[PDB]
Amino acid sequence: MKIGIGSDHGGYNLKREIADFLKKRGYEVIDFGTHGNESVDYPDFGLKVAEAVKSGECDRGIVICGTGLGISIAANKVPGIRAAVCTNSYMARMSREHNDANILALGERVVGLDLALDIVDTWLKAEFQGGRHATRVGKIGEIEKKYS
Template sequence: MKIAVASDHGGYELKEKVVEFLKEKGYDFQDFGTFSKESVDYPDMALIVAEKVAKGEFERGILICGTGIGISIAANKVKGIRAALCNDVYSARMSRLHNDANILAMGGRVIGPGLALLIVEEWLKTPFEGGRHKVRVDKITNYEQGQN
């Protein structure tokens, strides 16, 4: 599984912890920045990752800003993206099982690194359950493609 990772300045420190975790676990990933605490706009970072996931260049993405809210809103503007803001392990698991979330968003000023890494681990290992949930995800996809 190829994973695209990015953050704005508010999520930079947590992103660095996530990148370290991904390296340690042997995941195939690419860090698209930001690479310092210097201010950058979260939509720019979100759209880089969301476009790459939507085009199929990466199977999943992880985005981090201060709260996770702005970066998830921006990512969800890209067709084919189902970005889920998760602040707990249960939500991370359910975002994959029931929603087939392809981007995980987190808030670097909301959760600490220990919890964040548990969230990332759960989100990456959890498959999409399909079944009745696929029908629901397909309804979203169809609407997005103008087939409502």
């Protein structure tokens, strides 16, 4: 599958590691930037990844900033996007199983590298469980329709 990835300067180094991780595993990676350590604004890169996932240009996306919070909040503003900030593999599994998340958000200043690779591996392998969880994802779509 095609994984879009994006970060601010706060998640740039962890993004470099995950892009490498994913390519080694034979995923196609689209890197939406940022492309160095200079200060940039996490909403710009959250948006590029979220719109790539929404357009079907990427199948899913991973967004990284210092904590994961800002970039995931920004990505969740896009209708049809469910971005999950995960700090352990349990949350990552559940974000796929229950929330059908199509963006994984991570925080480079919170999770160390090997932990974050473990979360990514879990998230990429977990599967949506449907049922009552589809009903709940629909109700998330209803909120989007209300404020649309």
